[PDB]
Each structure stands twice: as structure tokens, then as C-alpha cells.
């Protein structure tokens, strides 16, 4: 889901003043703070997502690790099958 | 409305049809309940004229009349049985008592007589007696009045069933086969020693004893007796005997709802038939279910195969609750969030019409409490023969065979398309529509041919009428002659001339079809290619008939 | 009634000139460029003299190769990841 | 298939436990990692077979064998086994191949194919792999999840198996037959109690429970994340393969097992007779005699209904309710009628058209049931119920203890021949052979589409 009220922040849109940072959101020049961080979490990957955010927001795949497989079971083997040199390397 | 107006005690009369389904009017002498009249106009005489005062509320005398009508039915039954027992012909009796009493008395008397005949194996004499009774009822039916003619035909249904039974058992050779068939068919018994008059009569079939109820039915159309109908009755009573509800399934046009309706009919019950999944809300379903479980009546869920999932789940939960209540037998059931009593006589039946895939099945929670029974094609030949017999005939056997063969051949030959239907409904419609035509025409097969033409022919495509007339020529050899067209054709011609319309044999044929088939049908559907004079057609027919 | 103007995705000239304009701030680093005699045939820009042209060309090359690999055939999507990539580069 | 779903976590957990299962000495073959991989195959097959029915069990077994062998062996072996599997699917039949004195397995397979022992030819795949097939106890004890789905069909159940497993170890079973809203809240309060108590529980026919389980049980299972630390309860839900689809999160969270233990015909007669007779007799010797006869008839019909399309044109499910109705009808007719052979014909017709013919809707199947009923019920003087057992009439002194003793003895001493499917059931051996043919075709075909998928 997505509504063009966080649009002024998903895309950089702030009418900065001389010493104050303002953004036109809805009907109020809502105050902002430097520590404000927003992150969008998605439920499923199959569901189509709006194109505008894909242009703007930075997609990162934390999805379930169906692909590859080699890396996970490889890690399991190294931690399990004669692990001493493998984790001694990390040591 | 009835409570707030419980002073005229006559406005309720037009409500009580909904809450009995068998009677719609109540007789008043000056302020007393003289009797009731059923939907077909049959008048019931109540022995005890219920005196009414302005203080007694409506429901109090409603309660008293519930038992009063059943007591009057039992008394009329007793009088009819007494009059039949001492060697009296049925014809003088048909005009005295109600249809229920005469039917049940005839059933009991026939049961006893065939019992003694089976003990003696001299069925020829009884067969001859039954045949003379059939012929006498037939010739009496012609000159009788319609109000009683309904009674004659309704009883002739059961007498034809009895005659067929007697003949087929007489053809059977071994005593064991006779016992087999006799236990196969329904058998009637009464207990005079028991003081309880209401339960003094009961039905026995397949060795299972079911107590008859003297509830009034009026004169609903009698469903003729067929083997498959007997298997349906047997499986229904077998399911009921262990307190399991019945369940019928199969293709549409099999009369499953009509089968259970006839079961309640001959057993003396008004089976509340709820057609389902049309527009109806769950709340009224709960109300009627509570009513039937509190009164002891029987319900059938017509077209139960289709329902929305949530309402289906709710009604399944309720029906599982009530069925399990019958199983355990606890007096009270906590359904509809309220403690309600449960009459032991309450029972439920379900019908399943075919789905998109075909076989439609109950929710699995009901599998442990119901018995699904497939329903096959009814013996259309037998029912056609019986109907032709009851309407008076010359060659009813081969004529019925010809009609059934012609209908099947029509179904096989003509092109298949959505509105085409040649099921049992069409044959029943032909046999119920021919009667005025029979009065106008003769009774010969050509009258049946004309009925076929007036019913099925005007709903076909051009190639389909080609095939229809080809097969009509192939099977039947009676073509007929035009009649009573010396006036209607003239009226149509005058209407066309005054409307500036060019009369054509195509147009004339369509107009004749419409005029003939509008006499019976009430609401009409007109289908044809865009702008093909259908508006003009009904203008011409309407002003010509004006 | 409306006039329709097909803009479409940017072409090689656009990426070259635009990325040149941005990397005007940082076209050069410590010491000098790695040997600037790479193949000129695939150079959509002017001849390489600083890192500038090699960087813009490698970025555009990766961009269209990733687009032609992730999908097949016509790609009706403009480079948006390019802008984030170049911002990350400069920062 | 809806039930055959799987999760990444299950595969990784099985992979992790492959190694620390240093239980049985692996075959002394090439290196250590190769035998570790082969043990990986054995472990994943043993774990994941229990979630698959017999047909899918077999196809996955042989496909997995091929996956191992194609990679581990030469081109000649690969093409030879490909020719073998092509021969199995006669729609892709070819010429057999021979490798001299090298691969004894392939000669055995070709022998099984030629000798028309197609079922043995299939089962060879599992037999050669030296697998360790499991039961309910092994999977329940070894797995750590508290939830288990008791998958089966509508004609066989593992309820007695679960009960005897409990009685064998720690008991604690609480059978909860779900039903009405009163049954519903009793069930939910019982499971709430059992969460802390940790006793075993079993729910019947989750399909009819669909609304409650979607609303309550699914939400309860979702919420029971940290509640698994409580006393070790066992969650057992009986689901039917042909029933309604179960919610994906619920089936994914739980562990899965399917029942295939179909008892023998003699075993069916055994347990049906015992469960019917332990309630006590009602009337004379003829009552228990006809009870025995109808029990045998029920065994035969339950046997025949498992073959589709050989025998019945379509599959049916005969619940015990038919058995109770048959018993009630026989008891009633015997009470009504005198102690004679009089009511045999009417009883046969009633059974074939109402008690058991009511469900059926094909005149061919009606005729089959009618002829079977005429064979089993009609007759006297030592009826040959099966070609190996002779059942004589009760004698003239009418003692029922001797009758029950003789019936039990004649059931026990007589043994079931292997060809009972074709001998006890009046079916031509051609019919069962072509049934095996069709089974082989369908399984083998599915195996090709799988292998060309890889
Ligand atoms: N008997 C007739 N003689 C001469 N002309 C006729 C006759 N019947 C119909 N028409 C002509 O054919 C046309 C009738 O088409 P009309 O639209 O009335 O048919 P419809 O199928 O009933 O209607 P619609 O498809 O528009 O609902 C008119 O042009 C009318 O003049
Ligand atoms: N034995 C019979 N004799 C005469 N008519 C019958 C018989 N059985 C069914 N019919 C007719 O066939 C029609 C089919 O009814 P149907 O639509 O099958 O009922 P349902 O609602 O159970 O499907 C009924 O209207 C009935 O009049």
C-alpha cells in the first residue's frame, strides 16, 4: 500500500527556511527532526507494489532464502562436518 | 397484525394458509367455527362447532382447533371405516366423507382383504371386484362435479396402485415371492384396543412400524405409485426408523421434493417445504426450524445443494444439533441460543439437485446423521399410462408408450440448446393441458397430438420443428383437421388489415400458437431475432382477441 | 484532444552528459589515472583523459547490461537506480 | 497436491540432523563425504516419506534413486535404467539393455517386469535402498513440534492405532470428537487445559470442524509460539485427503503423517466381528449367524470398493452406519419372521437396494452388489463364502455358545491366500493384472514428467 501523503518525504521535497526545515504534508507545514527515520516493510513479495516507490524507495531483499540453498547448507556443513578449521578461520 | 386485530377473527383466515399450508379459509356460522376449506376448495366439516367469545384470545382457540380438526378427521375416518366394513360401495361414500378419511379407510380395508387373500391364495375374485370398482368409479367420474371429481381422481390413483399390485402378485407363483412383494409395499394397520384414538392407526412397510398422524392434507395432487417411488418410500422410512433424516440426491426433474411431499401426504402430514437459496434470510430459517421442532412437523430443504458458505454452515450446525437431539432423545435442545422442547415426531429431509460438476453432497458433519439416496429416472411410461387411465382412454397402454418414446426421441434428435427441456415436467404439462382440448376435441390420440403441438412445438428452432413433424409422422398416424379457426383467423385478418399488417402463413402460424398457448399460461416470455415483429405479433393477437 | 509526447528512457548521450556534469565535483583522485588507453569504440563519451569518462562509461554499461539481463526484450523503465548509484558514488 | 506442502525450515532441519545421526554404520564406500551424502538421502527419504501417500511415496523413492544413481554411475548405467523405466511406462517402451555381470539390480528389475510382477518391480526401488520406514511413534517421538496432522481417507482410520500407541507408552490420550457448539466449547476448554496439563489429545474430522479451526484453532496455533515450553502435550488432528483444503499456515506449522495400514480381509472380519459381538447377543442362534454373514459381506464390499475402475466404475465410501442399519434390519426381520429360511430374498433385496444400494448410483454397480449379495446371503447347506472357507447352517439343537465358538474358530484357523484379491473377490486375474498395469503407467508417467522437469 502507498498514499501520496508521505510522497513529500519518499521523494525529497522540503521547503527549507533560513534555519528551519519544513515539509508541506496534507494541510500543515509539519515540523521535522533530524532523527526521524521511516522504513517501509512488505508482507509478501509476490504482491505487486507501486512503481513510484520502486523508482524512489530502496528495495532490499530480506525474503525467505529459497534460492541458492548452496550457501545455507554449505554453512551447516562447515559448522557441522569437521568444523574446527572453518570456525578457527573466523577465530 | 393477527393479535392486534383478534376481534373480527376473520382477517386471520388469510394468514393461516401460511401457517398450515393445507387450509386457507375458516367457516363461520354466525360466530362459530363450522369448519375449514382447503386450497382446492374441499370443505371440511368440523363436528364440534367451536363457540367463540370476545375474551378468548386468537391463539387459544387456534390451539383448540388444532386438535379439533384432527379429532374430526378421526371421527370421519371411523364413520367411513364402519360404512365400508359392512359391504358398501365406495361411490355412495365418496360424497359423504373427506378425501383423507376415504383414502385411509380404503387403504386399511384393502390391506386386510389382501392379507386374507394371501392367506387363501384366491386373488382372482378380489381382482375382479377391484376391476368392477375401477370401472364404476370411472363412469361415475364423468357425470360428477369437479369439487367431488377431485376426490374421485385422487382415490382412483390409489385404487389403480392396488389393482396393479394385485395383478402383479397374482402373476407371481411362489408363496415366498408373494410375501416378498407384499412386505415390499406399504401396509396399513390399526389398533382398536388402544384407547388413544389419534395413534390408533399406523403404517407398516419393510417390517418397520410408523405411527400414522391424522393431520389434515386437503386434496393435493396424488403422486402416482411407481416402483422407484416405493424404493424411495422404503429408504425414507428405513432412515427414519433409526432417527436419521432422509437425504435424496440426483439429477433435476426427478420429483424428490414431490416424493417426500407425497410421503407426508399419504402418511397424513403437511411437510413444510422450504424452497431454498432464492432470496431468503437465515433468521426466518431459524424461526421456521424452531417452529417445526416445537410442533413435530417435517421439513424438506428443496434445492439444498446450492447455498452461500456462511448460511450453509449455520444451517448445517443447526440441523446437526437437532438431528443429534433426536439421536440422544433429550427433551430440550439449546439451539438458537434458547432452550426449546423437541417433539419426538420431528424429522428433517434434504434434497440435493445436481451441481455444476453434477454430484452434490452434504457438508461432512452431516454424513454421520443422514442417508444419501440417489434418485433415478422415474418410470415415465407407467405414470403416463396411469394418467391416461385416470383421464379415461381407449388404448392408454400403447398411447403412453408412444408418448414416452416420442419424447425421448425428440430429446435425442433435435439440436441441444439451453432452454430446451423435455423432462417429466413437459409430459405432465401436456397431460394437464390436454383436458380442455379433450373437451373440445374427441378423446382420440389426435387430441394428444394437438396438445403436443400446442405445448412443445412453438418453442423450437426451424430445423427442430422439421424434426418434430418428421417424428410425429413417424410415430403417430393421426394428423387432424383445422377446427374453430373460422372465427379466430377472421379476427386476426381483420386486426392485421386495420393495423396495415400483411398476414402471412408464418405470421398466422405464430399468432395461432400464441393465442392457443396464452389461454393457460399466465406470464409469457417472447423470444426471437431483433425486431422480428414480436411486438407486432402480440399487438395483432391482443386486438384480434379483443 | 491531448497532445502526446513520448519521452521514454534516457539514451547514451543523456547518461554520459548528465553523469559528467555531476562528477564534475569529483572527477579526480590521488596521483593520476590508471592507463587511459582502453578501447575507444564503445566509448559513448569524448576521449578518456581522467577517471571521468571511464567511470561514466562503466556505470552506463553496467546499467544497461543489468536491465537487459533482469528482463528480456523491451524494457519500459528508465534508470532510477542510476541516480542512487551515482549519489552513493560521490558521497 | 494441497496436503503435500513443504517448508524451507523443515528441509534445513532435516539436513542439520543428517550428520549427528551417526547411528548406523554407513556403507564402507568411496571417501567419507560421499557416504555422508548417501546417508543424507536415506535420512531425507525416511523423514519425508511419512508425509506422502503410497503412490507419491513410490514415485519420489524411485525418482530420488535415479537422481543419486545418474550422478554416481556411468553413462551405460544411466541409459540402461532409462530404458528400464521406459519399459515400465509402455507408452514409452523400448528394448531392454544388458550389462554383463556388473549390475545385478537391473537383471532383477527386468525379471520383475517380464514376470508381470509390476508391484514388486516398483517396490524394488525402496527395497534396494535399505531404508528404515517409520510409524507414528517414531515420527512423533523424534520430532519436536507438538502438532501432528493425522492424514487418511474416509474409509480407513488410525484412531485405534493412536490409542494402542498411547497404551504402549505414557497413554494420556484425550479423544475429543468435535461437533456442536457445546462440543466446540468443551473441545476448546479441553485444549486450554491440556496446554498446561500436557496430556495427549486427539480431534476427529477437522474437515467438518472447518469454521471452528479457521476461527479458533488456527488463531490458537498462531498464538502458541512461546507456549510450547509447557508440559509436553501431543496435538493430533485427523484430516481427510479428499476433504476440504486446510489453511496453509496451520498445515505448515504442524507436522504431517498419512495412514495407509489397510487391514486384510480376514483382519476386517476379525475386528468387525469382535467389535460387533462384544456388546452381547439379542436373540437366537440365527441372529449371530446372520450377523456373521453380514459382517463377511461388509468385508467383501469394503474390499471391492478399494479398486477403481476395476470392479466399481467409481470410488465409494461405506461408513459403519450402513453396518448398523444392516444389523438392525436383520435383527428386526428375524424377530418378526419365524425361524426359517423365509426372509432371505427380501433381506437380500433390502440390503442391495436400500442399506447399501442407496448411496450407489450406477446400475452396473447395483448389479454387482446384487449378485454379490445373492451369492453370500441366499443359500444354505455349507455356503462357500470364499473358496477356502465352508460355512454350514446352525444345527437343530440351537445353542448359541457353540455357534459363537465355532464361528470364531473357523475364522481363526482359516488363512487368507495371497490371491484373495482375485480369489475371494470374484474378479478375473486379468482385471487385477490390468489394474497393476494402470498403476504402473500412472506412477511411471508422473516420474518422467518429474525427471524431465529436472
Ligand atoms: N404482420 C406484419 N406485416 C407486416 N409488417 C410487419 C408485420 N409484423 C411486423 N412487421 C414489421 O416488422 C417490424 C416489426 O419489428 P419489431 O421491432 O416490432 O419487432 P420485435 O422483435 O417485437 O421488437 P424489438 O426487437 O424491437 O423489441 C416493423 O417494421 C413492422 O412494420
Ligand atoms: N412418480 C411420479 N408420477 C408423476 N409425476 C412425477 C413423479 N415423480 C415426479 N413427478 C413430476 O416430475 C417433476 C419433477 O420435480 P423435481 O423438479 O425433480 O423436484 P425437485 O425439486 O425435488 O427436483 C415434479 O413436478 C413432479 O410433478
Swiss-Prot record, chain A:
Location in or out of the cell: Cytoplasm, Cytoskeleton
Superkingdom as given in the UniProt entry: Eukaryota
Main function: Cytoplasmic dynein acts as a motor for the intracellular retrograde motility of vesicles and organelles along microtubules. Dynein has ATPase activity; the force-producing power stroke is thought to occur on release of ADP. Required to maintain uniform nuclear distribution in hyphae. May play an important role in the proper orientation of the mitotic spindle into the budding daughter cell yeast. Probably required for normal progression of the cell cycle.
Entry remark concerning the domains of this protein: Dynein heavy chains probably consist of an N-terminal stem (which binds cargo and interacts with other dynein components), and the head or motor domain. The motor contains six tandemly-linked AAA domains in the head, which form a ring. A stalk-like structure (formed by two of the coiled coil domains) protrudes between AAA 4 and AAA 5 and terminates in a microtubule-binding site. A seventh domain may also contribute to this ring; it is not clear whether the N-terminus or the C-terminus forms this extra domain.
Anything else known: Present with 195 molecules/cell in log phase SD medium.
Family indicated by similarity: Belongs to the dynein heavy chain family.
Subunit (UniProt): The dynein complex consists of at least two heavy chains and a number of intermediate and light chains. Interacts with DYN3.
Protein name: Dynein heavy chain, cytoplasmic
Organism lineage: Eukaryota, Fungi, Dikarya, Ascomycota, Saccharomycotina
Part of the whole protein covered: 3457 to 3547 of 4092
Curated annotation (Swiss-Prot), chain C:
Subcellular location: Cytoplasm, Cytoskeleton
Additional remarks: Present with 195 molecules/cell in log phase SD medium.
Subunit field text: The dynein complex consists of at least two heavy chains and a number of intermediate and light chains. Interacts with DYN3.
Annotated function: Cytoplasmic dynein acts as a motor for the intracellular retrograde motility of vesicles and organelles along microtubules. Dynein has ATPase activity; the force-producing power stroke is thought to occur on release of ADP. Required to maintain uniform nuclear distribution in hyphae. May play an important role in the proper orientation of the mitotic spindle into the budding daughter cell yeast. Probably required for normal progression of the cell cycle.
Stated family: Belongs to the dynein heavy chain family.
Domain notes: Dynein heavy chains probably consist of an N-terminal stem (which binds cargo and interacts with other dynein components), and the head or motor domain. The motor contains six tandemly-linked AAA domains in the head, which form a ring. A stalk-like structure (formed by two of the coiled coil domains) protrudes between AAA 4 and AAA 5 and terminates in a microtubule-binding site. A seventh domain may also contribute to this ring; it is not clear whether the N-terminus or the C-terminus forms this extra domain.
Name of this chain's protein: Dynein heavy chain, cytoplasmic
Location of this fragment in the whole protein: 2911 to 3001 of 4092
Swiss-Prot record, chain D:
Chain intervals for the UniProt region annotation (AAA 6): 122-332
Subcellular localization(s) per the UniProt record: Cytoplasm, Cytoskeleton
Domain observations: Dynein heavy chains probably consist of an N-terminal stem (which binds cargo and interacts with other dynein components), and the head or motor domain. The motor contains six tandemly-linked AAA domains in the head, which form a ring. A stalk-like structure (formed by two of the coiled coil domains) protrudes between AAA 4 and AAA 5 and terminates in a microtubule-binding site. A seventh domain may also contribute to this ring; it is not clear whether the N-terminus or the C-terminus forms this extra domain.
Subunit structure, interactors included: The dynein complex consists of at least two heavy chains and a number of intermediate and light chains. Interacts with DYN3.
Recorded family membership: Belongs to the dynein heavy chain family.
Extra facts: Present with 195 molecules/cell in log phase SD medium.
Function: Cytoplasmic dynein acts as a motor for the intracellular retrograde motility of vesicles and organelles along microtubules. Dynein has ATPase activity; the force-producing power stroke is thought to occur on release of ADP. Required to maintain uniform nuclear distribution in hyphae. May play an important role in the proper orientation of the mitotic spindle into the budding daughter cell yeast. Probably required for normal progression of the cell cycle.
Protein name (database record): Dynein heavy chain, cytoplasmic
Organism encoding this protein: Saccharomyces cerevisiae (strain ATCC 204508 / S288c) (Baker's yeast)
Span within the parent record: 3639 to 4092 of 4092
Amino acid at each position: 500500500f502507498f498514499d501520496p501523503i508521505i510522497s513529500r518525504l519518499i521523494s525529497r521535497e522540503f521547503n527549507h527556511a533560513g534555519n528551519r526545515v519544513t515539509v508541506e504534508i496534507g494541510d500543515h507545514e509539519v515540523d521535522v527532526s533530524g532523527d526521524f527515520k521511516l522504513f517501509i516493510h512488505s508482507c509478501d513479495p509476490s504482491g505487486d507494489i507501486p512503481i513510484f516507490l520502486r523508482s524512489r524507495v530502496r528495495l532490499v531483499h530480506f525474503v525467505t532464502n529459497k534460492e541458492s540453498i548452496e550457501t545455507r547448507i554449505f554453512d551447516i556443513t562447515l559448522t557441522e562436518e569437521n568444523a574446527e578449521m572453518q570456525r578457527k578461520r573466523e577465530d | 397484525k393477527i393479535i392486534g386485530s383478534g376481534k373480527h377473527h376473520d382477517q386471520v383466515s388469510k394468514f393461516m394458509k401460511k401457517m398450515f399450508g393445507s387450509i386457507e379459509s375458516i367457516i363461520f356460522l354466525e360466530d362459530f367455527i363450522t369448519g375449514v376449506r382447503s386450497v382446492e376448495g374441499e370443505v371440511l366439516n368440523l363436528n364440534e362447532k367451536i363457540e367463540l367469545k370476545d375474551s378468548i384470545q386468537a391463539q387459544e382457540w387456534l390451539n383448540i382447533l388444532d386438535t379439533e380438526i384432527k379429532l374430526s378427521v378421526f371421527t370421519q375416518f371411523r364413520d367411513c371405516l364402519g360404512q365400508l366394513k359392512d359391504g358398501t360401495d365406495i361411490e355412495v361414500v365418496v360424497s359423504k366423507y373427506i378425501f383423507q378419511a376415504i383414502l385411509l379407510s380404503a387403504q386399511v380395508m384393502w390391506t386386510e382383504l389382501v392379507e386374507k387373500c394371501l392367506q387363501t391364495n384366491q386373488f382372482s375374485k378380489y381382482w375382479k371386484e377391484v376391476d368392477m370398482k375401477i370401472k364404476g368409479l370411472l363412469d361415475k367420474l364423468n357425470k360428477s362435479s369437479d369439487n367431488v371429481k377431485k376426490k374421485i381422481e385422487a382415490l382412483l390413483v390409489e385404487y389403480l396402485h392396488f389393482n396393479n399390485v394385485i395383478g402383479q402378485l397374482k402373476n407371481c407363483s411362489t408363496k415366498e415371492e408373494a410375501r416378498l412383494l407384499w412386505a415390499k409395499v406399504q401396509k396399513f394397520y390399526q389398533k382398536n384396543d388402544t384407547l388413544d384414538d389419534l395413534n390408533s392407526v399406523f403404517i407398516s412397510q419393510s417390517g418397520y412400524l410408523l405411527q400414522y398422524k391424522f393431520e389434515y392434507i386437503g386434496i393435493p395432487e396424488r403422486l402416482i405409485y411407481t416402483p422407484l417411488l416405493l424404493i424411495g418410500f422404503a429408504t425414507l422410512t428405513d432412515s427414519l426408523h433409526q432417527k436419521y433424516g432422509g437425504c435424496f440426491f440426483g439429477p433435476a426433474g426427478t420429483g424428490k421434493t414431490e416424493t417426500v411431499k407425497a410421503f407426508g401426504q399419504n402418511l397424513g402430514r403437511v411437510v413444510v417445504v422450504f424452497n431454498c437459496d432464492d432470496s431468503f434470510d437465515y433468521q426466518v430459517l431459524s424461526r421456521l426450524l424452531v417452529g417445526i421442532t416445537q410442533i413435530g412437523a417435517w421439513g424438506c430443504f428443496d434445492e439444498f445443494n446450492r447455498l452461500d458458505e456462511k448460511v450453509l454452515s449455520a444451517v448445517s450446525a443447526n440441523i446437526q444439533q437437532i438431528q443429534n437431539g433426536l439421536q440422544v432423545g433429550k427433551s430440550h435442545i439449546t439451539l438458537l441460543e434458547e432452550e426449546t422442547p423437541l417433539s419426538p415426531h420431528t424429522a428433517v429431509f434434504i434434497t440435493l439437485n445436481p451441481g455444476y460438476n453434477g454430484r452434490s453432497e452434504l457438508p461432512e458433519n452431516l454424513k454421520k446423521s443422514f442417508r444419501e439416496f440417489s434418485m433415478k429416472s422415474p418410470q415415465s411410461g407407467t405414470i403416463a399410462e396411469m394418467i391416461l387411465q385416470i383421464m379415461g382412454f381407449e388404448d392408454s397402454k400403447s398411447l403412453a408408450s408412444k408418448i414416452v418414446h416420442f419424447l425421448e426421441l425428440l430429446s435425442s434428435k433435435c439440436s441441444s440448446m439451453n432452454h430446451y427441456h423435455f423432462g417429466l415436467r413437459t409430459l405432465k404439462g401436456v397431460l394437464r393441458n390436454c383436458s380442455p382440448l379433450i373437451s373440445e376435441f374427441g378423446e382420440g390420440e389426435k387430441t394428444v397430438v394437438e396438445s403436443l403441438k400446442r405445448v412443445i412445438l412453438p418453442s423450437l428452432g426451424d430445423t427442430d420443428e422439421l424434426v418434430f413433424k418428421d417424428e410425429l409422422s413417424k410415430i403417430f398416424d393421426s394428423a387432424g383437421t383445422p377446427l374453430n379457426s373460422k372465427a379466430i383467423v377472421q379476427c386476426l385478418k381483420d386486426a392485421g388489415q386495420r393495423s396495415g399488417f400483411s398476414m402471412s402463413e408464418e405470421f398466422l402460424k405464430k399468432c395461432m400458437q400464441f393465442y392457443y398457448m396464452q389461454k393457460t399460461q399466465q406470464a409469457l416470455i417472447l423470444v426471437g431475432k431483433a425486431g422480428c415483429g414480436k411486438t407486432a405479433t402480440w399487438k395483432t393477437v391482443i386486438d384480434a382477441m379483443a | 484532444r491531448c497532445i502526446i509526447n513520448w519521452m521514454g528512457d534516457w539514451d547514451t548521450k543523456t547518461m554520459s552528459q548528465v553523469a559528467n556534469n555531476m562528477v564534475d565535483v569529483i572527477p579526480m583522485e590521488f596521483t593520476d589515472f590508471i592507463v587511459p588507453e582502453v578501447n575507444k569504440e564503445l566509448v559513448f563519451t569524448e576521449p578518456i583523459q581522467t577517471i571521468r569518462d571511464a567511470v561514466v562509461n562503466i556505470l552506463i554499461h553496467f546499467d544497461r547490461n543489468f536491465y537487459q539481463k533482469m528482463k528480456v526484450g523491451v524494457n519500459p523503465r528508465s534508470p532510477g537506480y542510476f541516480i542512487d548509484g551515482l549519489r552513493a558514488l560521490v558521497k | 497436491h494441497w496436503f503435500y506442502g513443504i517448508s524451507i525450515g523443515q528441509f534445513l532441519s532435516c539436513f542439520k540432523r543428517v550428520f549427528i545421526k551417526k547411528s548406523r554404520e554407513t556403507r564402507a564406500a568411496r571417501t567419507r563425504v560421499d557416504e555422508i551424502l548417501w546417508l543424507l538421502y536415506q535420512e531425507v527419504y525416511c523423514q519425508f516419506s511419512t508425509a506422502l501417500d503410497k503412490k507419491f511415496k513410490m514415485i519420489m523413492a524411485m525418482t530420488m534413486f535415479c537422481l543419486y544413481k545418474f550422478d554416481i554411475e556411468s553413462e551405460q548405467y544411466k541409459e540402461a535404467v532409462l530404458t528400464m523405466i521406459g519399459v515400465l511406462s509402455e507408452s514409452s517402451d523400448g528394448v531392454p539393455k544388458l550389462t554383463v555381470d556388473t549390475n545385478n539390480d537391473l537383471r532383477y528389475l527386468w525379471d520383475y517386469v517380464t514376470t508381470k510382477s509390476y508391484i514388486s518391480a516398483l517396490n524394488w526401488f525402496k527395497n534396494e535402498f535399505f531404508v528404515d520406514e517409520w510409524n507414528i511413534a517414531d515420527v512423533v517421538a523424534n520430532s519436536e513440534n507438538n502438532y501432528f496432522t493425522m492424514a487418511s481417507e474416509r474409509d480407513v482410520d488410525g484412531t485405534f492405532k493412536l490409542i494402542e500407541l498411547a497404551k504402549a507408552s505414557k497413554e494420556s490420550l484425550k479423544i475429543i470428537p468435535l461437533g456442536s457448539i457445546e462440543n466446540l466449547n468443551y473441545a476448546q476448554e479441553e485444549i486450554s487445559k491440556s496446554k498446561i496439563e500436557g496430556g495427549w489429545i486427539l480431534l476427529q474430522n477437522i474437515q467438518m470442524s472447518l469454521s471452528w479451526v479457521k476461527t479458533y484453532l488456527h488463531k490458537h496455533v498462531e498464538e502458541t509460539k512461546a507456549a510450547e515450553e509447557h508440559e509436553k502435550f501431543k496435538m493430533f488432528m485427523t484430516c481427510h485427503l479428499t476433504g476440504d483444503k486446510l489453511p496453509a499456515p496451520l498445515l505448515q506449522r504442524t507436522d504431517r503423517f498419512v495412514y495407509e495400514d489397510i487391514p486384510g480381509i480376514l483382519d476386517t472380519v476379525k475386528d468387525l466381528w469382535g467389535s460387533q459381538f462384544f456388546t452381547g447377543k439379542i436373540s437366537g442362534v440365527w441372529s449371530v449367524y446372520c450377523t456373521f454373514l453380514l459382517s463377511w459381506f461388509h468385508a467383501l464390499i469394503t474390499a471391492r470398493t478399494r479398486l477403481v475402475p476395476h470392479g466399481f466404475s467409481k470410488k465409494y465410501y461405506f461408513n459403519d452406519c450402513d453396518f448398523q442399519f444392516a444389523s438392525v434390519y436383520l435383527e428386526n426381520v428375524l424377530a418378526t419372521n419365524s425361524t426359517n429360511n423365509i426372509p432371505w430374498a427380501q433381506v437380500r433385496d433390502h440390503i442391495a437396494t436400500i442399506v447399501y444400494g442407496g448411496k450407489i448410483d450406477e446400475e452396473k454397480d447395483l448389479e454387482v452388489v446384487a449378485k454379490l449379495c445373492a451369492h453370500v446371503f441366499c443359500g444354505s447347506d455349507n455356503l462357500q463364502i470364499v473358496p477356502g472357507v465352508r460355512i454350514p447352517q446352525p444345527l437343530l439343537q440351537q445353542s448359541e455358545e457353540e455357534e459363537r465358538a465355532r464361528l470364531t474358530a473357523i475364522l481363526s484357523n482359516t488363512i487368507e491366500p495371497a490371491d484373495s484379491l482375485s480369489s475371494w473377490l470374484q474378479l478375473p486375474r486379468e482385471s487385477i493384472l490390468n489394474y497393476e498395469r494402470l498403476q504402473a503407467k500412472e506412477v511411471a508417467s508422473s516420474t518422467e514428467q518429474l525427471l524431465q522437469e529436472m
